[PDB]
Amino acid sequence: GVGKTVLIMELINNVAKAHGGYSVFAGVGERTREGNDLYHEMIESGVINLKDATSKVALVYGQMNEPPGARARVALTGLTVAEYFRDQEGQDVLLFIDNIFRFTQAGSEVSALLGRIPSAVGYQPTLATDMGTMQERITTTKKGSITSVQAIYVPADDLTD
Amino acid sequence: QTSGGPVDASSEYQQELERELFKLKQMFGNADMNTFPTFKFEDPKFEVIEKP
Amino acid sequence: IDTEKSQQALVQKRHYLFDVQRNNIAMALEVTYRERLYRVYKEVKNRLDYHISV
Amino acid sequence: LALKTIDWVAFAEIIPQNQKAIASSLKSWNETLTSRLAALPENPPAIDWAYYKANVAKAGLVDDFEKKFNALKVPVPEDKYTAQVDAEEKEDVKSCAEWVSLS
């Protein structure tokens, strides 16, 4: 209900203008309908330019109809295309992750497929290290910085999940 | 044999050195740090402190 | 009579306002002087160690 | 830095009711100067060239930079304000001396 795509697009615009930072948007486990909606809203509002080279965001999408491996590595794909900007252009990149809980649950599905024994509630035994090996690359190095805006879903409304 | 080439036949590793030193200078100072500094000073404000 | 005497005592103690003006002016200018000292000191050391670091 | 001994509400007995804010504002400023002078030392810690001559690879840049330093006159601030308040105090001493004479 509340306008969140507008806040995301405005953060992209501002960070591109105030600083010189480009943005990356990862689409972990996203609904293809909402992905198309976001693509067209960002084309309309000028953040994406189909006819010039003045686009301020790169898009990476792993939809919901993709195997758990895709949905698990798509956040890393976005992280890599942002790390390039940071470490080779000294920019202050903005990396969005449209849902981090779907990243967690895709890792859970992957580890389940590989035959590993689940842990508390059913998540992977490597939940903390899998989250860490990703989030530890969103840092501020001596070359630049990556600031991450990660939409969060709280399952069953339990903040202790 | 490298007095003829400061960084041993590179023509590379410079594109990043310029950026790194850019940060280096940029926040070590924002002037001609090679120079000696000339100083503008400012001195305090004051008001009517006698009995009005 | 006693009220007059108390007024006399107060107006005797009067001079603290002026000597406080004095103290504040002195302290302010001393602070400014030492701040200039440290300004120039810090910044020339900053140039020097900039050269060292690079 | 020579300073004057001070009582504080002895300073508030004498302050009239038209400039209380001015008075305790000067009080607050006094406290700001107390802590601020108490914080930093008197003189800056001078710097050794041996660590700065055996380190810099530039030609004598250490020596001429620090020579300009050790040959620098920093502008000493001047009072320009104690005399006027001293004269004001003398005049008030006169005024209230005659007041107490009448009384």
Separation of alpha carbons B27 and C41, rounded Å: 18
Interhelix angle for D20-39 vs C16-53, to 10°? Answer: 40
User: C-alpha A76: how far from its chain's center?
Assistant: 8
Residues contacting residue B20 through CB under 8 Å, at least 6 positions apart: A142, A143
Hey, is the C-beta of B19 within 8 angstroms of any chain A C-beta? yes
- How far is C54 from D59, CA to CA, in rounded Å? 15
- Buried b / exposed e over A95-128, threshold 16 CB at 10 Å, is bbbbbbbbbbbbbbbbbeeeeeeeeeeebbebbe
Structure token digits, residue A114: 């590989």
Q: Are D77 and C33 in contact (CB under 8 A)?
A: yes
Distance between CA atoms of residues A151 and A38, nearest Å: 15
**Residue numbers of A annotated as active site:** 4, 30-31
User: Residue A33 annotated as binding?
Assistant: no
Nearest chain C residue to D63, by CA: C48
Q: Dig out the tokens for C27 from the structure.
A: 């302290």
Contact between A93 and A144 (Cβ < 8 Å): yes
Q: What angle do CA A50, A99, A91 make, to 5 degrees?
A: 55
Q: 3-class DSSP state for residue A62?
A: strand
d(CA B51, CA D76): 29
A133 burial via Cβ count (<10 Å: 0-12, 13-18, 19+):
exposed
What's the resolution in A?
A: 2.8
Neighbours of C10 (CB within 10 A): 13
DSSP element (H, E) containing A146? strand A145-150
A160 is in an annotated binding site: no
Task: Give the technique used to solve this structure.
Answer: cryo-EM
* Residue C43 in contact with partner chain D when CB distance is under 8 A: no
What is each CA distance from C21 to A7, A102, D7, in whole angstroms?
54, 68, 14
- As to burial, measured by CB atoms within 10 angstroms (0-12 exposed, 13-18 middle, 19+ buried), residue D36 is middle
Whether residues C46 and B43 touch (CB distance < 8 A) is answered with: no
Tokens of C37: 């000292």
Q: To probe the interface with C, which of B28, B42, B48 has the most C CB atoms within 10 Å?
A: B28
